[PDB]
């Protein structure tokens, strides 16, 4: 699992379960192509989101469907989506964790990149 | 102005000056049309970014070039960009402020939406 | 106005009005002396909280009553209080703004220090 | 473990290692009694910070020595400490994880509470 997520709900104080996301890779011409989808489990994580073979060096975009998450919680959200875009260098089994803390009108995102 | 930003630097405890951004408006086909560009002043703001006339209801995208900000600050950043995407309902002189708090490997974004 | 606050509500997307706060100064013996109290207005701010004369160099605590903010909203919060503790060096008309972004189970706090 | 911490460093994108902290319980007279100290490991966690025997219902403070962390990282920090203050087990026993995201002039705290 070279690419992990950890999503927390700042209203309830729990992980954010059943958050849908989409992973895209930047193409040589400057656009995007979607390579994977996932939904968080009750711990706010997605196991086996993509394989190492699917995660070579390059720029990736992870789109988190925060609007649906909040709608399904019965809240009104501000953001249409939460996007995280980063250049990955998985050389040497370098692993990436995208952390996301959700509120209806706010999110915080950070990354933990292993050695 | 109907669309304001406020960018702060969490490493230095100052506003984030000279951050470039782009504002786009979603098209019925799901494309994006760029409608404005700008650069924050030393208070982390952009005054008169767009007019009310230019800000009808619809989905908007604001793309903050945080990578150049951090590279110029001498830090290596994680994110290639920071994008904020939201549906706007400007009816009644409802105004939007996008607040962004930057660190090299993290950002917090929130919105303040005024009453009619 | 050497000491300013700005409090936002991450659930509703508004300033956090009517938040009570207390300002304390650390004493030589390791204790705290309360020097000011205040309540945020509808913009999430407090004007004329303390004067420059009252704000000599030293360590200060600002205690925000976030629990009552959420409880009076009908929400259920985690934190008893939010405290911000910092060493101030106000020489040269150096001003401090404490920014606070509130959710029921989270808060983000940052500082803007002028030149 | 009824009380866990997870500390991340938003400058480097790593867990925050070797962060010292102190856990205190509020006393009926308004004082604080220290019940434990600890130091995070390289994963930004402290295993077995307190035991169940040390964790009756009541108000607790976790004081994180963030200033020493940044000083050793070679940065100039704003805050003296980061304090997290919460009522434990208000409606019955729970387990608590205190997440803390550190920058030199800012931090984000949230909590994950489970049954
Ligand atoms: O559980 C963790 O990954 C540690 O706690 C956090 C979680 C999130 Cl989602 C964020 Cl943005 C920060 C921290 Cl410290
Ligand atoms: O909103 C302000 O003007 C000052 O305080 C903040 C600044 C930022 Cl960038 C964020 Cl994300 C939150 C707050 Cl409270």
TrEMBL record, chain B:
Superkingdom, taxonomy of origin: Eukaryota
MF-aspect GO terms: hormone activity; thyroid hormone binding
Main localization, broad class: secreted
Transthyretin/hydroxyisourate hydrolase domain: residues covered: 1-116
The keyword ATP-binding is annotated on this UniProt entry: no
Family: Belongs to the transthyretin family.
Designated name of the protein: Transthyretin
Species this protein is from: Sparus aurata
């Amino acid at each position: 699992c070279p690419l992990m997520v950890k999503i927390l709900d700042a209203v309830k104080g729990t992980p954010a379960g059943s958050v849908a996301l989409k992973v895209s890779q930047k193409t040589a011409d400057g656009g995007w192509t979607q390579i994977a989808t996932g939904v968080t489990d009750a711990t706010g994580e997605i196991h086996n989101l993509i394989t190492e073979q699917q995660f070579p060096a390059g720029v990736y975009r992870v789109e988190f469907d925060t609007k649906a998450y909040w709608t399904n919680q019965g809240s009104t959200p501000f953001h249409e989506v939460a996007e995280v875009v980063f250049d990955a260098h998985p050389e040497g089994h370098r692993h990436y964790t995208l952390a996301l803390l959700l509120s209806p009108f706010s999110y915080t995102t950070t990354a933990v990149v292993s050695s």
